[PDB]
């Protein structure tokens, strides 16, 4: 090292500087606030009744935790799509409404709720944006809602003269005119009701039995964020090398306990310097500090070059228990190990100097190591 | 790196490690202005012992 | 250090920092020059003796009272009463709370040799 | 729902000296022993504050809103209630609605239609009661409801003794509405002005609101005969400067100094 | 110049001469605090002749 | 000031621009090193073509 540092192939007698020497980390952590205001999907998706599609039940949901993991984990599903992002990563999605449009409609007729696509429901009753964000769940629901007495409390619109624009809700159903021929009162000559009503019963054809179907929306970045997944946290670590991460606290150091005294809203801790030197975990309650990982130059204390060839090894300003750590198999950043573990150990002031014994005659200075201690090369 | 591309970032980078070596330079600059009025002061100190 | 303050524990940027040149090499010399030049202004000032001489416990010098400057064995240090006051009005976490690899390297000499230095002048000077 | 009465002599707005009132802290930090400069909005030492003196006397006109506000209220039968933000007032854009009159601190933003006089004050004949509630007329669009448990106050009105001084500051930045509380009891003496002391403000609550507002006009709580009890409150504005703070060993704020005010300074 | 047009290659051939100059720079500032120690060394040789 | 007007291909524009060369900016136009001004075109097969 000191012979390519100097750029020649002899080294004087005496002392020398090389790269210095850092610690590497040796693992990860994570820590976030206990999860908790779950969002109130669990009474909707567990609800008796769904009304029908032209009175489709909007629900607004935001302020709250969306356990998308038990979503995609729910036992009597039979449809589950996301047509504008990727249903896998809804755990880090964070949009600042929810819409859920919930309803029963007939299984035959459920891929026209995708936008785009025509359909009674879609045209007459319920349509959605063709540039539609959002998810879709279908699943059976005949096995509670279907009865073999006779279900035809459910209704959809069959006729009308427009469709509506996306986000309309009707409950007008006037009687409908088609031609020319005026008409009022009750029913008469070309005077069709608007609806007509369902019949769900579990001995109709398979595939024609009633699904409900939920279409959750939202939106994207116009307004403070409000719900989206939990951001799971691992356990903790003490004493060690490790990147942490405490609410966007990326960094690196060592983690101590701590003796000083915070105020219940503080959370973060810094010095004159102004940098970050203590926080307070999380989910639970106590101060913790943070000390940098242990590093330093690195120093060769040689005698001439023909006169030897063995050499000395000084660490800069190294607590000396600690470079057991640097005593390791791809952890310092030297790479000459046959040095990390040599002779006696011997401490200074400046370090701990690994090579030489520490005799304790008297004799003039040679090479300056520091601190009233200087070596040489002798019997 | 997070928010800015992999490709032109590095203006930003370059002009944050010049302002830094522009600084460390200073700072050395100092240190040897004062590192030599400390040595004047030295050998007076020397010549009167 | 070279890269620990600028960008330090960072690849790309140390990858795109080593293409400028020899820059931090000349700035660890020059500050490598200023070091050893300071261990050797105390070097030059204070060892112009070669014998470390001792004053005898005896301390009738002919009615001169030399107690304030003579080393007093009181204090575990061979430090005088002039001394300890000129230690204790001078004040500076400070020598480590710099952190960003700037080493506070520590000066040759210690106080004790300093003082031992100071007590052979004076004996000299007086015997 | 809402009954006019009206009928009152329009006082001229009095004028105190807001001694070093208007302090806060900044942002959650840990700082110890240390002394630490910064640049804010703040209310500047030394400054014109607005006094309304209510008592018969009924004194609540609508208020210019600019950088934030800061409020407080020197009284101890704790008769103002309520706080209405807005940039119309008229329904056509939703608005903040702040009571916490019993049940608990209610926080609203919605389009509702008001009233021109927003009164729970009258009540016959000797005590009050929260009557005549309908301050809005309609419930349009609520976008946000917050709900949480009422602060520290007393029961029903009266008069005599003020030993309660109660600080608010109110702040609108970025979409998100930041309000800042302290309480403080037993005052001795009253020249119906503020006291000289030192003070910070804390941290309470953050809102996560983002709307347009301009102007408000505060609260206070059948509307016809009555003699309501003495009361005291003060308004003052902010505007942005810069601040050097004293941080103590314990990490609250204990002093802070101007900068802009004298050679001194 | 070989590759690039005048416009945009003109601006990195300022980077360059702006950097070679601020060398330039650095090695003069050096050779004045050499040249006033030398001054003081010969003076003092002055003296002692 | 000065107005300059033609019609050429719009897979051509590209060469219009200082620095860069070209058949149409060696044989018919080129703009000098550092034009100051603004160039505006557009599409006229509706008319011209
Ligand atoms: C976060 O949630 C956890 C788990 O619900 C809470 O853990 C508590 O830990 C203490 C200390 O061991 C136990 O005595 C309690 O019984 C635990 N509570 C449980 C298991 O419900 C933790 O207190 C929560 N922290 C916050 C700030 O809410
Ligand atoms: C020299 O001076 C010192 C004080 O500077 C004398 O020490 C004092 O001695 C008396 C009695 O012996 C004590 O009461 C004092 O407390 C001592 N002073 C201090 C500061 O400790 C010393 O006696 C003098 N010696 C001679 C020979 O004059
Ligand atoms: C964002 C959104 O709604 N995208 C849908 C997509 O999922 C569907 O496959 C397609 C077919 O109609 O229509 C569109
Ligand atoms: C609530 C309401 O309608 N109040 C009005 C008031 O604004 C108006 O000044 C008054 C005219 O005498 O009539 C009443
Ligand atoms: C609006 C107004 O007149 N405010 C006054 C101010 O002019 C005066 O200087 C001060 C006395 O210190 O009292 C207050
Ligand atoms: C809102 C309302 O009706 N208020 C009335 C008030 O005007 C009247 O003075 C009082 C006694 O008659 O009775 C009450
Ligand atoms: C080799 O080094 C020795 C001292 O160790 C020296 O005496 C000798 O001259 C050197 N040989 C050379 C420089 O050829
Ligand atoms: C290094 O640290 C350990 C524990 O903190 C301590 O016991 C030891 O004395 C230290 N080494 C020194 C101070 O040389
Ligand atoms: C010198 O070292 C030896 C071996 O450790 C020890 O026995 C002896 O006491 C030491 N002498 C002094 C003066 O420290």
């Not at chain 1, 500087?17 to 040796?26: A, C, G, I, K």
């Not at chain 3, 430090?79 to 480590?96: G, H, P, Q, W, Y």
Request: hydrophobic letters at 35%; a neutral charge.
């Amino acid at each position: 090292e000191t012979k390519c540092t100097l750029k020649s192939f002899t080294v004087e007698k005496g002392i020398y500087q090389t790269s210095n020497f850092r610690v590497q980390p040796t693992e990860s952590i994570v820590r976030f606030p206990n999860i908790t205001n779950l969002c109130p999907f669990d009474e909707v998706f567990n609800a008796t009744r769904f009304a029908s599609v032209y009175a489709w039940n909007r629900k607004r949901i935001s302020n709250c935790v969306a356990d998308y993991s038990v979503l995609y984990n729910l036992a009597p599903f039979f449809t589950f799509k996301c047509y504008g992002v990727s249903p896998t990563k809804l755990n880090d999605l964070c949009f600042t409404n929810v819409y859920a449009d919930s309803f029963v409609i007939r299984g035959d007729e459920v891929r026209q709720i995708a936008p785009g696509q025509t359909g009674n429901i879609a045209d007459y009753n319920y349509k959605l944006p063709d540039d539609f964000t959002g998810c879709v769940i279908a699943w059976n629901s005949n096995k509670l809602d279907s009865k073999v007495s006779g279900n035809y409390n459910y209704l959809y619109r069959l006729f009308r003269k427009s469709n509506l624009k996306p986000f309309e809700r009707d409950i007008s159903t006037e009687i409908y005119q088609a031609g020319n021929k005026p008409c009022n009162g009750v029913a008469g000559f070309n005077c069709y009701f608007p609806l007509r009503s369902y019949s769900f019963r579990p001995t109709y054809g398979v595939g024609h039995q009633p699904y409900r179907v939920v279409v959750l929306s939202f939106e994207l970045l116009h307004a403070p964020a409000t719900v989206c997944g939990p951001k799971k946290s691992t356990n903790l670590v003490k004493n060690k090398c490790v990147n942490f991460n405490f609410n966007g606290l990326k960094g690196t150091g060592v983690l101590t306990e701590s003796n000083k005294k915070f105020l219940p809203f503080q959370q973060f801790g810094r010095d004159i310097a102004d940098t970050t030197d203590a926080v307070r975990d999380p989910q639970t309650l106590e101060i913790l500090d943070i000390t940098p990982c242990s590093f330093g130059g690195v120093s060769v204390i040689t005698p001439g070059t023909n006169t030897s060839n063995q050499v000395a090894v000084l660490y800069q300003g190294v607590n000396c228990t600690e470079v057991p750590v640097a005593i390791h198999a791809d952890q310092l950043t030297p790479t000459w190990r046959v040095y990390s573990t040599g002779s006696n150990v011997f401490q200074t002031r400046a370090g701990c100097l690994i090579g030489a014994e520490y005799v304790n005659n008297s004799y003039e200075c040679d090479i300056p190591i520091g601190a009233g201690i200087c070596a040489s090369y002798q019997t | 790196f997070s928010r800015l591309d992999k490709v032109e970032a590095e203006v930003q980078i370059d002009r944050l490690i010049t302002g830094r070596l522009q600084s460390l330079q200073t700072y050395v600059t100092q240190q040897l202005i004062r590192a030599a009025e400390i040595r004047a002061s030295a050998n007076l100190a020397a010549t009167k012992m | 250090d070279c890269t620990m303050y600028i960008c330090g524990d960072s690849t790309e940027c140390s990858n795109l920092l080593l293409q400028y040149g020899s820059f931090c090499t000349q700035l660890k010399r020059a500050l490598t020059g200023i070091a050893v030049e300071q261990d050797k202004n105390t070097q030059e000032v204070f060892a112009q003796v070669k014998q470390i001489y001792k004053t005898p416990p005896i301390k009738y010098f002919g009615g001169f009272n030399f107690s304030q400057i003579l080393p007093d064995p009181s204090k575990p240090s061979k430090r005088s009463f002039i001394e300890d006051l000129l230690f204790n009005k001078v004040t500076l976490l400070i020598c480590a709370q710099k952190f960003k690899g700037l080493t506070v390297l520590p000066p040759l000499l210690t106080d004790e040799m300093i003082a031992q230095y100071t007590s052979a002048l004076l004996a000299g000077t007086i015997t | 729902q809402c009954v006019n009465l009206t009928t009152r002599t329009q006082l001229p707005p009095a004028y105190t000296n807001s001694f070093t009132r208007g302090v806060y802290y900044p942002d959650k930090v840990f700082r110890s022993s240390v002394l630490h400069s910064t640049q804010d909005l703040f209310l500047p030492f030394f400054s014109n504050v607005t006094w309304f003196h209510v008592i018969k006397r009924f004194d609540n006109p609508v208020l210019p809103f600019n950088d934030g506000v800061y409020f407080a209220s020197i009284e101890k039968s704790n008769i103002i209630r309520g706080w209405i933000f807005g940039t119309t007032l008229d329904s056509k854009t939703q608005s903040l609605l702040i009571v916490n009159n019993a049940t608990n601190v209610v926080i609203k933003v919605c389009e509702f239609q008001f009233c021109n006089d927003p009164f729970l004050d009258h009540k016959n004949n000797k005590s009050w009661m929260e009557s005549e509630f309908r301050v809005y007329s309609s419930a349009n669009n609520c976008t946000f409801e917050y709900v949480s448990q009422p602060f520290l106050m007393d029961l029903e009105g009266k008069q005599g003794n003020f030993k309660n001084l109660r600080e608010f500051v109110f702040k609108n930045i970025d979409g998100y509405f930041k309000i800042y509380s302290k309480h403080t009891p037993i005052i001795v003496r009253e020249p119906e002005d503020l006291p000289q002391g030192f003070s910070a403000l804390e941290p309470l609550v953050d809102l996560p609101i983002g709307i347009n507002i301009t102007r408000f006009q505060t609260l206070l709580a059948s509307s016809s005969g009555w003699t309501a009890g003495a009361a005291a409150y003060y308004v003052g504005y902010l505007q942005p400067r810069t601040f050097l703070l004293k941080y103590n060993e314990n990490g609250t704020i204990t002093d802070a100094v101007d900068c802009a005010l004298d050679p001194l300074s």
